Design a protein around this nucleic acid. Structure first.
Ligand SMILES: [Mg+2]
Ligand SMILES: [Mg+2]
Ligand SMILES: [Mg+2]
Ligand SMILES: [Mg+2]
Ligand SMILES: [Mg+2]
Ligand SMILES: [Mg+2]
Ligand SMILES: [Mg+2]
Ligand SMILES: [Mg+2]
Ligand SMILES: [Mg+2]
Ligand SMILES: [Mg+2]
Ligand SMILES: [Mg+2]
Lengths: 100, 47, 122, 58, 82, 50
RNA sequence: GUGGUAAUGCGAUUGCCAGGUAACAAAUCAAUCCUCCCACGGUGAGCUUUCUUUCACCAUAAUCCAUCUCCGGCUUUGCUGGGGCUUGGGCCUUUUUACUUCUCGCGUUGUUCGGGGGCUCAAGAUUGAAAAAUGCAGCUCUCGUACUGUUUGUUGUGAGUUCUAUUAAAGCAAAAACCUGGGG
RNA sequence: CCCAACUGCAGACCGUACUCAUCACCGCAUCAGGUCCCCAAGCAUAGAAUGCUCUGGUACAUAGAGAAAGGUACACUCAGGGAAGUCGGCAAAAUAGAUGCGUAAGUUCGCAAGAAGCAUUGGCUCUGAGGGCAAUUGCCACUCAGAACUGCUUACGGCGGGGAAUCCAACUGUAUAAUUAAAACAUAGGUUUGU
RNA sequence: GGCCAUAACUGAAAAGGGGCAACAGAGAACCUGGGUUAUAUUCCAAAAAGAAAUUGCAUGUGG
RNA sequence: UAGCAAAGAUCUAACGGAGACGUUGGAUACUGGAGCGGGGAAGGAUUUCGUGCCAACGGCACUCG
RNA sequence: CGGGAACCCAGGUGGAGGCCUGUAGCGAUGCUGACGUGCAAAUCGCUCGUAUGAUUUGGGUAUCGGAGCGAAAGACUCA
């Protein structure tokens, strides 16, 4: 049940990160999040949920961390704010963005 | 060179590295025992 | 104005080599004021003299075949170019296949058959 | 470098006359005693509160 | 990034004497000499030249300082005869 | 390349010093005959071999 | 100098003789090493109209210490011995192989030795020191400032180790220093 | 008494930059020549072949504007014929890898021989076996074999033209650096002479 | 006048005079980390950046 | 005038400069691990480095060597 | 070794060889190629010979002028 979260720095408060943004971090976390074999629907394979900003999931199979670092880097590119923040694993299991 | 230092500049010398330059002139680097500050001799010797 | 010195030793501080050090072009008087490999180490710490990433020499083309050449789709009559005793040696398909017939008969002197004249008869 | 496997022989060879320094070390999963004699450094690594004891005086 | 290496010392020849390639804690992979592992203490060549048991193959420096019981058994003609 | 005797080293050092120009306080001397050094070696042109 | 039936263990010295090391062409073949690959898991940057994860990084020096306990005995107060890592050797002890048996290696051969324990031997790993404050590096923040990660497994090729075959009317240097012994 | 281990002091001389080459050396020179050694990545591939790439290195070898003829090429094709060219198949083509099938004359039995000569080659999904870990099916292998499928009879690079004879030399070898690589020298073999 | 100690100057056997010749043979006590415009297995000074090995002479704990 | 024809094709920005030149960035390349690589011996002996400089030398040029 | 009173029929193993293809290395056959006021006082290209060897190569070391050395071309001995 690895809990691989995701943070939100000033590009959450100062940057435009709201339901219009994080609701794409909810859809893509199911619509862009791949699954075993067939990819897509992310509810029956590995448990995930949302919080204030921590986007930890609960998977009990082979399940990486740099995986989310580009799913978000594809979400941080589907918002064109690839320069407005850089994803970074500031912890030991969760990533923490920061501006430049 | 160590003996000469101590006879000329009353300081200790630990490591005296030498080299015969491409001028036939033998240079000498001289550690001053960490107890005689070198910057207090160049100012004494007038370097 | 010329940044040859600051570029020569920043490649000797980053320990990468040229075409890896990126001297920021939008400012040269910043770089030109270095003139020393400690004043350049400070510059490297700042924005001005990054080392650009090396390159991406792909290898997924190879692992595409390495995936398609362990279970099947190996070479064919027209892909071979060297003799079979040069591709798959003859002297080592005997060697292994004979290690195995001996690694198996020493296994069968533990508790298997008589092992005197049903081992060395064989 | 030798690693003193003793509390008596160490406290003997650690309290010798050379004693260039005794660098108290803190590392994960242990606590290490580096005495610097003239020619070796003798370590005594330990897993106990005995580290802070023989740290104050030795 | 596959670095190549140098003969660090002043001999740059591949004689059976040098025979140097190790990774470094600074990841600066660089190569060092070996010792030429000498054959050990043997019986006389006339008498079936064989290695002596209980004896080591120490080199001229290891042999010149190690103890005497690393090169001879406690028999008579120990370290010369098996 | 890296091996030169010290004596052979003392003889190239005596040539590195002889390869300096005439200083511009010599040609205002009263009656000298020197305008150029006319013994300047260039390492490519001519070799010493000692 | 003193112990083990024995292989041989251990402890702190000046002249002759005898050995030994130095000291040996190339081969073929099996582990470390390093190179590279792959599966790993972790970090940084790259791709993104798209499609996807590509690439990088992940390091351990000389010189040392001892094979942790399996076990006596799962730590009483801990003995009888602190032996062990394995695979290639050379041996040792003890019991055997004659009906031709047998042991072999990829291989041209060994016995006239076949198993159980031991003694060493050189590769070589291992824990420990060196050694992480190093180093690579990202980072949360703001050369200061802190800390979060400090990962090994697989393959393949190779250099040496391994076995002082083969061409030999070719048999594949010498010596110092050094080492051991006999007499001392 | 003697040695070790622990300390203590000291550890001298010379070399050390740079170069090692399409700019550093020799060649008269910043010369397409010559020049010893080490380190040596990925993929195709028998692979230090050759082709292309990551590292490292380098794009200051005069540059520009153009359709002459003529010329030089590690440049090509060319209808039909195919050595009629020429002193002469010189040059060029052609041959080609792999695998399978076959392979004469002669012969010093080793060879000739890759003889000659045919045949198949792709891509794809497969199905076969081929192995290390214990009371029988568990986990850590890319090699070959076959099947159909589909499509080129049009496809980097690298890669023998072959046969029949005659002559000479037995052979590998050496050798006229700067016009002669041979049938010459050598050679093994044979004999001779001296001693 | 001998405990003990340096030294002089003799002189104990001991055949085969010396001496060169190898920056690829032999031999050879050091390894990482890092702070030069250009040197580093060469430099770093005292929380030697460290860690070793090693030769000479010494004092001394072990018999 | 012959020629400067074997061996790597420079292209651009903005910058410097008294001005085809240099530097930096980006781009496309070439060497291709028997290398236009990194180290040495032989040999050379300051060619190293930096800062200038640009008269003549680098067979074109140069702000560069 | 298999298989059948002589020693043949085959199956492997092993990896010899002044053997073969071929890289470097060392040579220089053809083009009588290109150069011939060269790149060069002998070079360049392609082809080509050999490439475990009577091999190639480094340093040291021997032997030289009425002489040396030569698998012998009167070749070579600092153009
Ligand atoms: Mg020996
Ligand atoms: Mg021998
Ligand atoms: Mg194997
Ligand atoms: Mg001898
Ligand atoms: Mg040249
Ligand atoms: Mg000359
Ligand atoms: Mg490149
Ligand atoms: Mg035609
Ligand atoms: Mg026809
Ligand atoms: Mg050839
Ligand atoms: Mg030499």
């Amino acid at each position: 049940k690895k809990v691989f979260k995701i943070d939100c720095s000033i590009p959450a408060a100062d940057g435009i990160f709201s339901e219009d943004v994080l609701g794409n971090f909810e859809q893509f976390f199911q619509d862009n999040t791949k699954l075993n074999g067939r990819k897509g629907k992310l509810s029956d394979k590995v448990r995930l949920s949302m919080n204030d900003n921590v986007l930890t999931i609960s998977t009990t199979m082979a399940y990486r961390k740099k995986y989310f670092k580009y799913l978000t880097k594809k979400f941080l590119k589907k918002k064109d704010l690839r320069d407005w923040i850089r994803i970074l694993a500031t912890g030991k299991g969760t990533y923490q963005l920061k501006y430049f | 060179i160590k003996k000469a230092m101590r006879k000329l500049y009353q300081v200790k010398a630990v490591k005296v590295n030498t080299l015969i330059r491409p001028d036939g002139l033998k240079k000498a680097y001289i550690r001053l025992s960490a107890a005689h500050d070198a910057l207090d001799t160049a100012n004494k010797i007038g370097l | 104005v010329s940044l040859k010195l600051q570029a020569r030793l920043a490649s000797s501080i980053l320990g990468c080599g040229r075409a890896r050090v990126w001297l920021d072009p939008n400012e040269a008087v910043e770089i030109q004021n270095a003139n020393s490999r400690k004043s350049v180490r400070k510059l490297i710490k700042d924005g001005f003299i990054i080392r650009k990433p090396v390159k991406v020499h792909s290898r997924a083309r190879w692992r595409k075949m390495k995936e398609a050449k362990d279970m099947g789709r190996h070479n064919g009559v027209g892909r071979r170019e060297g003799s079979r005793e040069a591709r798959m040696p003859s002297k080592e398909l005997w060697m292994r296949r004979l290690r195995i017939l001996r690694r198996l008969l020493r296994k069968y002197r533990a508790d298997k058959k008589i092992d005197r004249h049903v081992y060395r008869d064989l | 470098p030798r690693e003193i496997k003793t509390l008596k022989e160490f406290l003997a060879i650690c309290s010798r006359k050379d004693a260039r320094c005794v660098k108290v070390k803190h590392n994960p999963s242990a606590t290490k005693f580096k005495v610097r004699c003239s020619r070796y450094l003798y370590t005594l690594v330990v897993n106990d509160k005995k580290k802070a004891d023989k740290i104050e005086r030795s | 990034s596959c670095p190549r290496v140098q003969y660090r010392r002043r001999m740059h020849y591949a004689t059976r004497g040098n025979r140097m390639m190790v990774r470094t804690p600074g990841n600066k992979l660089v190569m060092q000499k070996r010792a030429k592992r000498s054959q050990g203490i043997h019986t006389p060549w006339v008498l079936g030249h064989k290695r002596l048991g209980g004896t080591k193959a120490l080199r001229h420096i290891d042999a010149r300082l190690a103890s005497r019981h690393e090169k001879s058994v406690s028999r008579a003609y120990g370290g010369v005869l098996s | 390349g890296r091996f030169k005797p010290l004596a052979v080293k003392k003889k190239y050092a005596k040539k590195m010093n002889q390869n300096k120009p005439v200083p511009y306080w010599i040609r205002l001397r009263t009656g000298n005959r020197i305008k150029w050094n006319e013994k300047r070696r260039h390492w490519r042109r001519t070799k010493l071999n000692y």
